[PDB]
A paper describes a structure:
The toxin MazF is an endoribonuclease that recognizes ACA subsequences within single-stranded mRNAs and rRNA precursors, and catalyzes the hydrolysis of adjacent phosphodiester bonds. , In turn, the antitoxin MazE prevents MazF catalysis by the formation of a protein–protein complex that blocks the access of substrates to the toxin active site. Each monomer is composed of seven β-strands forming an antiparallel and highly twisted β-sheet, followed by a long C-terminal α-helix. The toxin displays a large concave cavity at the homodimer interface, whose central region is characterized by a positive surface electrostatic potential, while the edges are amphiphilic with positively charged and hydrophobic residues. The N-acetylated and C-amidated synthetic peptide, named Small Antitoxin of MazF (SamF), interacts specifically and with high affinity with MazF, preventing its ribonucleolytic activity by competing with RNA substrates for the same binding site.
Therefore, all biophysical experiments, with the sole exception of MazF kinetic assays, were carried out with the catalytically less active mutant containing glutamic acid 24 replaced with alanine (MazFE24A), which resembles the WT protein structure and leads to homogeneous samples that are produced at high yields in E. coli. Structural deviations are mainly seen in the β-strands S3, S4, and S5 that are slightly shorter in the peptide-bound state, which causes an elongation in the corresponding interstrand loops. As in the unbound state, SamF adopts a helical conformation when it is complexed with MazFE24A. Two molecules of SamF bind at the dimeric interface of MazFE24A, where they form intermolecular contacts with residues in α-helix H1 of one subunit and with residues in α-helix H3 as well as in the interstrand loops S3–S4 of the opposite subunit. The binding site of SamF is the same one that accommodates MazE subsequence 54–67 in the MazE-MazF complex. The aromatic ring of SamF’s F4 is buried into a hydrophobic pocket, in which it gets close to the side chains of V108 at the α-helix H3 and P59/F60 at the interstrand loops S3–S4 of the same monomer. The side chain of SamF’s F8 is sandwiched between the aromatic rings of F60/Y39 and the aliphatic side chains of M38 and P59, indicating that this residue may have a central role in toxin binding. At the α-helix H1 of MazFE24A, the side chain of K42 is in a favorable orientation to form a salt bridge with SamF’s D9. As SamF, the substrate makes pronounced interactions with α-helix H1 and the interstrand loop S3–S4 of the toxin, and thus, upon binding, SamF blocks the access to the toxin substrate binding site, a similar inhibition mechanism that should be employed by the MazE_54–67 polypeptide region.
Residue numbers in the entry:
A (entry chain A), C (entry chain A): 1 to 18, 29 to 111
B (entry chain B), D (entry chain B): 1 to 12
The structure:
């Protein structure tokens, strides 16, 4: 069996850098480059302008949209934990767009 | 954009 | 003298991670968080969809817009080397926006 | 967007 998981947008993955992360880039990109864009999650909701609270009960369930980073997802050990809700993914993207200007 | 950065400044 | 350089958008900085980088985030953000968004530069132009060739003659003068990353600019030693042209900065941002979707 | 990803696919 040769096929293996490749992150897709909206995936919540366990990764060694920025442990939970939300994938923003699409499968077509992630499958060809070995990289994906992702946003790290942390524990505490603070009302920080760039945070997005994720539904569910996970320990690290606040995404920090401003700390987006390209990561080499194979080398960092990306394992899929689940997904975020579409509305959460869209709020993350909107906040990054504001930062990029 | 303008609303967002107003809120950012206010937060900090 | 207490004031020190804080990156601003369009700055080309020498940084220890992703050596030359283009700053995308604005001073108001960079000055409060200790972080900025930046894109790494590399040597070779390949026609890669996410590359943006920078004017000038520097060794690492091709920005890889898809490898944007939040960096802790003080800890990575950000020193200003110069600037990129406005049109180059706008092409980088547009390409990141496509990746974010 | 559509043009861009067409070009990306073609490149690879
Ligand atoms: Na595949
Ligand atoms: Na200052």
């Amino acid at each position: 069996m040769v096929s293996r998981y490749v992150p897709d947008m909206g995936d919540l993955i366990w990764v060694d850098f920025d442990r939970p992360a939300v994938v923003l880039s699409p499968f077509m990109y992630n499958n060809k480059t070995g990289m994906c864009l992702c946003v790290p999650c942390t524990t505490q909701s603070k009302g920080y302008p760039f945070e997005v609270v994720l539904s569910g009960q996970e320990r690290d369930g606040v995404a920090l949209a401003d700390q987006v980073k390209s990561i080499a997802w194979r080398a960092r050990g990306a394992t899929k934990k689940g997904t975020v809700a579409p509305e959460e993914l869209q709020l993350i993207k909107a906040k990054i767009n504001v930062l990029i200007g | 954009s303008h609303l967002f950065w107003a809120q950012f400044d206010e937060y900090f």
